[PDB]
Amino acid sequence: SNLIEVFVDGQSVMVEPGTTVLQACEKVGMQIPRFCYHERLSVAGNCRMCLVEIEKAPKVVAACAMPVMKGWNILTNSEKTKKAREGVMEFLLANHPLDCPICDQGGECDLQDQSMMFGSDRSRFLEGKRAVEDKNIGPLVKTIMTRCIQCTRCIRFASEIAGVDDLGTTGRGNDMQVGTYIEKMFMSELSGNIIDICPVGALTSKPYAFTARPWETRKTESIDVMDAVGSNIVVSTRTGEVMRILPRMHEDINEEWISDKTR
Amino acid sequence: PFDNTTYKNLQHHDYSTYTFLDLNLDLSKFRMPQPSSGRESPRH
Amino acid sequence: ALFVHRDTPKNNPETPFDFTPENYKRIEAIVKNYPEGHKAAAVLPVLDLAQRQNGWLPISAMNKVAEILQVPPMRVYEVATFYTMYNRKPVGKYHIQVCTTTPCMLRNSDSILEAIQKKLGIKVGETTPDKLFTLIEVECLGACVNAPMVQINDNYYEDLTPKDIEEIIDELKAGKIPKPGPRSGRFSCEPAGGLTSLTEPPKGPGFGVQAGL
Amino acid sequence: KTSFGSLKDEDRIFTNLYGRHDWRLKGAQSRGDWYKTKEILLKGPDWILGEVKTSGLRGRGGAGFPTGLKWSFMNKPSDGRPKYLVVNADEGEPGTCKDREIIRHDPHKLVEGCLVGGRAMGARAAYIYIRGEFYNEASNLQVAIREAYEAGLIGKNACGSGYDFDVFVVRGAGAYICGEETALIESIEGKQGKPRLKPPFPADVGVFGCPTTVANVETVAVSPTICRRGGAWFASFGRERNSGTKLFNISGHVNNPCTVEEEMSVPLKELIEKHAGGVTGGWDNLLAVIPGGSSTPLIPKSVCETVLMDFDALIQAQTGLGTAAVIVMDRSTDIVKAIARLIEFYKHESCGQCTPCREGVDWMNKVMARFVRGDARPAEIDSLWEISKQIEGHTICALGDGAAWPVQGLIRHFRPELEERMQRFAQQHQ
Ligand SMILES: NC(=O)C1=CN([C@@H]2O[C@H](COP(=O)(O)OP(=O)(O)OC[C@H]3O[C@@H](n4cnc5c(N)ncnc54)[C@H](O)[C@@H]3O)[C@@H](O)[C@H]2O)C=CC1
Ligand SMILES: Cc1cc2nc3c(=O)[nH]c(=O)nc-3n(C[C@H](O)[C@H](O)[C@H](O)COP(=O)(O)O)c2cc1C
Ligand code: SF4
Ligand code: SF4
Ligand code: SF4
Ligand code: FES
Ligand code: FES
Ligand SMILES: [K+]
């Protein structure tokens, strides 16, 4: 074996060369927070939420993108790792709209949850927030782009897995927007999966819209029958009524996606 | 003779909107044959 | 100022655009500057070529650049909305760009912005009603010692006063083309009160060449 | 040598800086360009890299990385991918107008630099990524490249050396961020000019995924003069680890704003009072100097009195050398308006990729726009300081650093002027 030895908080772990910092921390049961990293999409490195201190290094590294060198001690819980996480969460929540009650992502929001777990408890932003024009990409995905945090999981899903190349970023700076730039309708056979991986409620399910809320739903693990792939699903119900259908991760079938008929 | 009193770069007063691209088209005959990645595009 | 497209009757995917055949030979020369398999690298010149023919970019020039380079159209829309030169609205015949960053602001670019506004009767972002002049306000143009300065379509007009830029707009309205240079006494970038350096003749080929060469 | 500056005209690398001689091939060959270029190329890559490492040349783009150590990263055996020198001619920095002068007036010096540097790094071709706003300079450089192809100096069998080397010019399209080397690489590749993360450094995965060195126009155009005159001749100027000559752009509130080539560790006061005619109203009218273009923090008048204009003496003056673009600001300058216009530049020139620049530079611009009017309370100074520290080192490229640093310099040297601005706002509006 050619495994290199690295350290996560002093704990030795033997990792394959080419492994990122985030995967090396995954191997000891620590989960580095993330918004743009996804293990089935390409590495983006553009939310900076995964910034972690390697010790004896005066700069945090994007753990989703940085490969481990031999002998690093990844400080997942040091003071400047936490200051980096609170600063990046402050910038993510600076222009974010106060929509948490009227948002379908509430209760199951990555942004809410790791704002609670890794960011500050309050605001210093005394300014006015931006407001993004909404888009119309079809009858399946409700689009409220003020909630977008520009993680580009849209674009990497549509380009790399759905293979569509219709989503992109237009503009520059804080005015950069996610969309198709024209009135174009994103209707793939895998189009609803962008509802799953959007960490915020910028892309939501238009059929599921406003009807339920994640804590009150019951999660029955079950099988798709819309094709002979046999996708593993979660039928989430509420008070004896089927509310929605999510995927289950099965690595050998449907890795974590389902089709739009299934959904 | 030696002259240090005039501005010798007076050519760019006469450049049109297609000067750069016609110069590139003129240069196209001089150049080495490009390398290939073996495919027509990364979507091929 | 927007970054979504709405189909107007003058900007729609059936607005007539096609390159001239000499522009197709120019596009062939552009694509031959890049390796085979990376034709997408010619998105930025060819799209700019589409702006040099048409004056601006309707969304059929974007579609034509996407079609002849075999890239997706969104990959051209990203380039057209990222870069500040691609005019996604038709600008006037003379596209005045006044630099108002700090090196040009400290040498009073505001006076020249105001002088262009009171000469043309428009403000920043507007176009004159005869479609001749579009006045916008740009960032640093790389002519900082020649502050204050403007750019008109290809040309830098430098070391300007309000009277100089009024004269430039006068001889632009008269059909002539002015000299792209500093309107002060100096030529390009030298100190104005005589050369403080390079007053000697250059030494010529072979000066100071070390041994073994 | 303890005193620096007063560079002689026989020691100038960029003769014909001012456009007073012929920039074309007949004018360039009679100034020393393309002299014994075959003899330089036939001494191989290792000799040229030894001359650049011996010269102590640091990267003239603005960071000052050691140029020979940088270019030696390409000196490795191939694996099927071609190799590319890419010349950074974008030059978006406010204050900086020197690479325009090299391209406009000494283009064959840049082309011979492309050939010598690409031979040093084994590069197949040169992409000179030029600013799109420099149309006349790009056509100027294209005429010089046509003269270099027709003289047999580049292309097939460059200078009779049996080394094949093309020189391409790529025009930008109006982005400051496409001066950053990985964003410039993405801009050559037909995409949005968004910076790549590092690693991979461009010597591993650069333009088109090939080995690639991005280098400034100035650090490329001095390399044949270094290889002819010797690395010791170049290293005999400036302080130690600060070797050579440098182009300086004195702009703002001086009597004669100019580009001038000077020895490295020249004092700032000597540079201004010699080549620029002094600060308007005399040296006692000086308020502040941004030493190296917009990304470096300002220094006040008390620091400008003794400091030397190289990398190390300006890092000791808690600023940077940067692009050596000296912006001079006299006592009549509203300095908060100038720094806020600079942060407004940084939010109009920010690509939007990562979170701290995309959000925090607009939020710093809003805080600075309230600071110009005084529409703030003094506890928002320190907050803004921390906002800068949350952008600094948390971003992908150094535009986030380059937007944090003017805010930090303004706060650090001019907190009381901000405070009196805010308190006169508070007394005339409440
Ligand atoms: N010239 C101009 O117009 C502008 C210049 N700047 C200056 O640019 C600087 C920031 O630019 P950066 O490229 O981000 O600075 P720096 O962090 O990256 O690196 C400088 C150079 O060294 C190389 N390098 C550094 N460490 C390396 C390693 N371990 N292996 C291989 N290569 C390595 C990089 O590839 C780069 O080309 C600042 O000093 C700023 O003042 C900023 C804006 C405009
Ligand atoms: C936002 C940003 C803009 C930059 N713009 C330029 C530029 O316009 N020209 C330049 O030579 N370097 C620029 N740089 C520095 C480059 O990253 C790189 O260091 C340089 O182009 C090549 O290295 P060198 O100094 O050895 O030549 C910029 C850096 C950043 C972060
Ligand atoms: S996306 Fe998350 S943080 Fe934003 S409004 Fe919805 S629940 Fe709240
Ligand atoms: S809409 Fe969602 S998935 Fe798409 S870029 Fe924005 S936050 Fe990411
Ligand atoms: S910090 Fe700004 S300039 Fe750099 S990758 Fe991010 S958005 Fe781009
Ligand atoms: S998760 Fe690594 S930066 Fe987004
Ligand atoms: S500041 Fe106006 S040209 Fe650089
Ligand atoms: K979602």
Side-chain angles (χ1 to χ4, degrees):
Chain A
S1 67
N2 53 2
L3 303 177
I4 56 171
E5 180 180 1
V6 295
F7 296 95
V8 180
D9 295 329
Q11 184 180 2
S12 176
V13 60
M14 298 299 293
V15 297
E16 186 178 2
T19 299
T20 62
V21 174
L22 191 148
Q23 291 172 349
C25 297
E26 179 181 359
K27 288 180 70 66
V28 303
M30 192 273 169
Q31 190 181 9
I32 293 171
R34 83 286 305 278
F35 286 102
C36 77
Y37 177 71
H38 189 275
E39 68 182 1
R40 305 185 195 277
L41 302 174
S42 67
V43 175
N46 61 5
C47 76
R48 313 299 289 168
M49 190 66 205
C50 74
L51 290 174
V52 69
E53 180 186 4
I54 307 301
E55 75 177 1
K56 295 182 286 183
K59 190 175 180 182
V60 293
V61 301
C64 72
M66 181 65 72
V68 287
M69 297 300 291
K70 184 179 185 295
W72 281 0
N73 193 1
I74 309 164
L75 297 179
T76 63
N77 204 2
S78 66
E79 184 177 1
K80 70 183 288 184
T81 301
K82 295 189 288 184
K83 289 186 185 292
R85 289 172 185 169
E86 293 178 0
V88 171
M89 184 54 67
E90 185 175 5
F91 296 126
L92 286 166
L93 297 176
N95 282 314
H96 192 71
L98 274 76
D99 285 335
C100 291
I102 61 167
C103 183
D104 289 332
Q105 195 64 38
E108 57 188 1
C109 185
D110 275 325
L111 184 62
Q112 281 183 352
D113 288 338
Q114 60 198 356
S115 173
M116 293 299 294
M117 297 300 105
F118 300 104
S120 178
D121 56 350
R122 62 193 65 198
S123 181
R124 300 184 297 175
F125 182 77
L126 298 172
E127 300 294 326
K129 297 177 181 290
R130 66 176 174 178
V132 185
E133 176 178 357
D134 293 334
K135 280 79 179 173
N136 191 2
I137 62 170
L140 296 179
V141 180
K142 185 180 284 186
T143 289
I144 298 168
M145 284 295 107
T146 310
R147 302 172 189 170
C148 176
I149 62 166
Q150 285 85 19
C151 77
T152 67
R153 286 184 185 179
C154 280
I155 308 165
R156 289 177 287 163
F157 184 79
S159 179
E160 298 169 359
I161 296 172
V164 175
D165 283 327
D166 289 338
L167 295 171
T169 54
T170 57
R172 199 177 70 188
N174 209 166
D175 290 330
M176 187 184 76
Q177 297 175 358
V178 176
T180 62
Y181 174 73
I182 56 172
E183 294 180 354
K184 193 171 179 65
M185 191 178 286
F186 177 69
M187 295 299 283
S188 178
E189 75 274 10
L190 298 174
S191 67
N193 289 315
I194 70 174
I195 300 165
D196 287 333
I197 51 172
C198 183
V200 299
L203 303 172
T204 52
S205 176
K206 190 185 262 80
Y208 178 68
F210 305 156
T211 60
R213 184 70 88 185
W215 56 82
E216 68 183 3
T217 59
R218 296 180 185 272
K219 273 76 74 176
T220 298
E221 300 184 353
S222 179
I223 308 299
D224 189 12
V225 298
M226 293 297 170
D227 53 354
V229 174
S231 295
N232 295 338
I233 61 173
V234 168
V235 178
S236 80
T237 63
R238 193 269 313 277
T239 62
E241 184 185 359
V242 174
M243 291 292 108
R244 70 186 175 182
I245 292 171
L246 301 177
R248 284 191 287 127
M249 178 187 71
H250 193 282
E251 291 291 328
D252 297 329
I253 296 167
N254 58 345
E255 293 179 353
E256 70 179 16
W257 319 109
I258 58 178
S259 69
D260 284 336
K261 186 189 289 181
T262 301
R263 191 180 296 273
Chain B
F2 178 72
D3 183 73
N4 202 0
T5 61
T6 61
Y7 184 67
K8 301 289 181 66
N9 193 358
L10 294 177
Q11 292 83 14
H12 72 278
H13 299 284
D14 294 333
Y15 290 164
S16 67
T17 62
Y18 293 110
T19 301
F20 181 80
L21 298 169
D22 290 331
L23 284 163
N24 196 3
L25 180 60
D26 196 1
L27 288 178
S28 181
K29 66 180 183 292
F30 292 105
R31 298 182 184 277
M32 297 299 292
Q34 295 293 323
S36 178
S37 65
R39 63 182 68 249
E40 186 180 0
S41 71
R43 291 187 292 116
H44 284 80
Chain C
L2 296 172
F3 296 108
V4 298
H5 176 72
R6 295 180 179 91
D7 288 331
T8 61
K10 64 180 73 175
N11 193 0
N12 54 2
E14 290 85 5
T15 296
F17 183 79
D18 189 71
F19 295 107
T20 63
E22 62 273 17
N23 286 120
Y24 282 113
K25 293 185 285 291
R26 292 184 179 100
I27 288 167
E28 291 178 353
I30 288 169
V31 175
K32 283 173 92 287
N33 299 125
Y34 300 109
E36 295 293 327
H38 296 88
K39 188 173 182 181
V43 161
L44 274 79
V46 172
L47 190 67
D48 181 72
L49 191 150
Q51 187 180 2
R52 289 181 182 271
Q53 175 180 355
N54 203 5
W56 65 286
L57 294 177
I59 191 160
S60 299
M62 301 180 189
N63 289 320
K64 186 67 70 176
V65 169
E67 191 268 331
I68 68 172
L69 296 174
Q70 291 87 21
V71 302
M74 190 62 204
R75 305 292 180 265
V76 178
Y77 302 156
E78 290 178 354
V79 173
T81 58
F82 187 81
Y83 292 94
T84 56
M85 287 184 182
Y86 296 117
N87 298 115
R88 294 177 290 112
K89 290 183 183 293
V91 301
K93 190 164 79 74
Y94 297 110
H95 187 262
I96 299 171
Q97 296 179 356
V98 179
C99 177
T100 57
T101 54
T102 299
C104 287
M105 184 183 70
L106 289 176
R107 295 185 66 86
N108 199 2
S109 67
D110 290 329
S111 66
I112 292 168
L113 187 64
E114 286 174 353
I116 294 169
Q117 285 178 354
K118 63 100 172 178
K119 181 69 184 297
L120 295 177
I122 60 173
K123 63 181 72 174
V124 176
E126 292 181 353
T127 307
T128 61
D130 54 358
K131 302 294 188 292
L132 290 179
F133 296 99
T134 302
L135 174 63
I136 64 168
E137 183 178 359
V138 296
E139 304 298 325
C140 173
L141 294 178
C144 307
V145 299
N146 297 114
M149 55 81 61
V150 302
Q151 182 183 3
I152 298 167
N153 289 320
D154 278 324
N155 289 317
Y156 282 179
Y157 294 97
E158 295 171 352
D159 286 333
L160 295 172
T161 61
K163 183 176 72 67
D164 286 328
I165 196 64
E166 284 175 352
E167 181 176 359
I168 290 170
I169 295 170
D170 284 331
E171 59 184 356
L172 282 173
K173 289 186 283 187
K176 297 183 290 294
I177 187 71
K179 294 290 180 68
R183 298 292 179 184
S184 65
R186 60 177 178 175
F187 293 113
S188 67
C189 71
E190 67 267 13
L195 300 177
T196 65
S197 67
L198 296 174
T199 62
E200 294 293 325
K203 294 295 182 182
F207 184 77
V209 176
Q210 61 180 353
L213 182 66
Chain D
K1 185 185 286 185
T2 62
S3 67
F4 299 97
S6 69
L7 185 63
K8 295 185 291 295
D9 289 331
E10 67 183 2
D11 289 329
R12 300 296 173 93
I13 297 172
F14 296 104
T15 65
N16 192 5
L17 182 65
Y18 293 147
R20 302 293 181 90
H21 296 91
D22 196 1
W23 60 267
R24 292 184 288 114
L25 185 62
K26 296 297 294 296
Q29 287 176 352
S30 67
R31 292 191 299 272
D33 291 331
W34 296 106
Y35 181 75
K36 285 183 182 177
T37 303
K38 179 176 72 68
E39 285 80 0
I40 296 169
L41 300 183
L42 288 175
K43 294 182 78 69
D46 288 327
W47 182 75
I48 300 169
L49 292 177
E51 290 292 326
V52 178
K53 289 172 72 176
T54 305
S55 68
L57 179 63
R58 291 177 65 183
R60 303 298 186 190
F65 193 81
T67 303
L69 182 61
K70 182 180 179 181
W71 292 359
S72 66
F73 291 153
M74 297 282 283
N75 196 2
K76 64 181 181 291
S78 176
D79 53 354
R81 295 178 293 170
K83 290 192 285 183
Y84 294 104
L85 174 60
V86 177
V87 183
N88 191 347
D90 188 77
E91 200 185 13
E93 184 66 10
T96 304
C97 56
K98 58 180 178 66
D99 299 331
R100 178 174 183 263
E101 299 296 325
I102 303 171
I103 295 162
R104 186 173 58 175
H105 294 163
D106 289 328
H108 294 280
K109 191 174 290 182
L110 179 58
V111 177
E112 190 182 3
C114 291
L115 180 60
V116 171
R119 181 71 183 93
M121 66 186 66
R124 186 184 182 275
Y127 288 94
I128 302 172
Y129 185 80
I130 198 164
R131 191 172 187 169
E133 279 95 5
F134 293 165
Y135 184 76
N136 295 320
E137 290 83 3
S139 297
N140 211 149
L141 181 60
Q142 282 286 104
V143 174
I145 289 165
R146 187 182 64 187
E147 292 178 353
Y149 276 109
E150 291 180 351
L153 299 171
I154 54 174
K156 180 66 181 293
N157 195 3
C159 296
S161 65
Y163 185 72
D164 296 334
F165 186 78
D166 286 333
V167 179
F168 302 97
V169 171
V170 178
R171 292 183 66 248
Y176 166 74
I177 187 53
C178 296
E180 195 273 337
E181 69 170 7
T182 57
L184 176 146
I185 281 170
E186 298 287 310
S187 179
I188 295 171
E189 293 177 356
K191 289 178 280 182
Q192 286 173 340
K194 293 187 176 178
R196 298 178 183 177
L197 282 78
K198 293 176 184 177
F201 292 95
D204 297 328
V205 175
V207 66
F208 313 113
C210 291
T212 299
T213 291
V214 180
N216 195 9
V217 177
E218 186 181 1
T219 187
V220 160
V222 299
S223 59
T225 305
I226 290 170
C227 292
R228 288 194 295 268
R229 302 290 296 273
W233 179 75
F234 191 79
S236 67
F237 296 102
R239 294 191 294 119
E240 189 174 0
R241 280 89 64 192
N242 290 316
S243 298
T245 66
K246 184 67 178 67
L247 293 173
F248 292 92
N249 292 309
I250 301 99
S251 66
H253 287 161
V254 292
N255 292 317
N256 293 316
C258 68
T259 303
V260 62
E261 184 173 358
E262 193 66 29
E263 195 181 1
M264 197 68 199
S265 299
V266 61
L268 180 60
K269 181 175 168 65
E270 179 172 357
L271 184 68
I272 295 167
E273 294 179 355
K274 185 174 180 180
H275 297 290
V279 181
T280 61
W283 182 260
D284 291 329
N285 202 5
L286 179 60
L287 182 64
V289 167
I290 305 167
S294 69
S295 67
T296 62
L298 51 87
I299 52 174
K301 185 256 182 65
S302 67
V303 181
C304 296
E305 187 68 28
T306 61
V307 75
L308 303 178
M309 288 301 293
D310 54 351
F311 292 101
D312 295 332
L314 286 176
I315 293 169
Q316 293 304 110
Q318 59 188 356
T319 182
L321 178 66
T323 70
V326 177
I327 304 167
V328 172
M329 303 165 71
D330 60 355
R331 296 293 302 275
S332 66
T333 297
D334 192 1
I335 188 159
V336 179
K337 181 175 71 70
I339 297 301
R341 182 60 183 84
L342 209 63
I343 301 304
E344 184 178 0
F345 173 80
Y346 282 109
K347 78 158 286 291
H348 289 291
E349 300 295 330
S350 170
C351 88
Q353 188 177 1
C354 75
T355 301
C357 177
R358 178 183 64 246
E359 304 295 327
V361 177
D362 195 6
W363 177 31
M364 289 197 295
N365 196 12
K366 291 181 182 178
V367 172
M368 286 301 297
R370 292 188 295 113
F371 280 179
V372 173
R373 296 181 294 116
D375 193 3
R377 62 186 180 92
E380 299 183 358
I381 300 171
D382 290 327
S383 178
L384 184 62
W385 181 265
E386 289 180 353
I387 292 167
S388 68
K389 298 294 184 183
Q390 289 175 354
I391 299 172
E392 185 181 3
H394 291 85
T395 58
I396 297 170
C397 80
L399 192 150
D401 301 333
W405 289 346
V407 169
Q408 294 177 359
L410 179 67
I411 289 170
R412 185 174 62 243
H413 295 289
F414 290 95
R415 190 185 175 97
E417 200 269 328
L418 289 168
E419 290 177 353
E420 62 92 17
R421 186 75 61 85
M422 285 182 287
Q423 72 184 358
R424 73 175 182 267
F425 182 83
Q427 64 89 29
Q428 78 184 0
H429 287 281
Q430 296 298 322

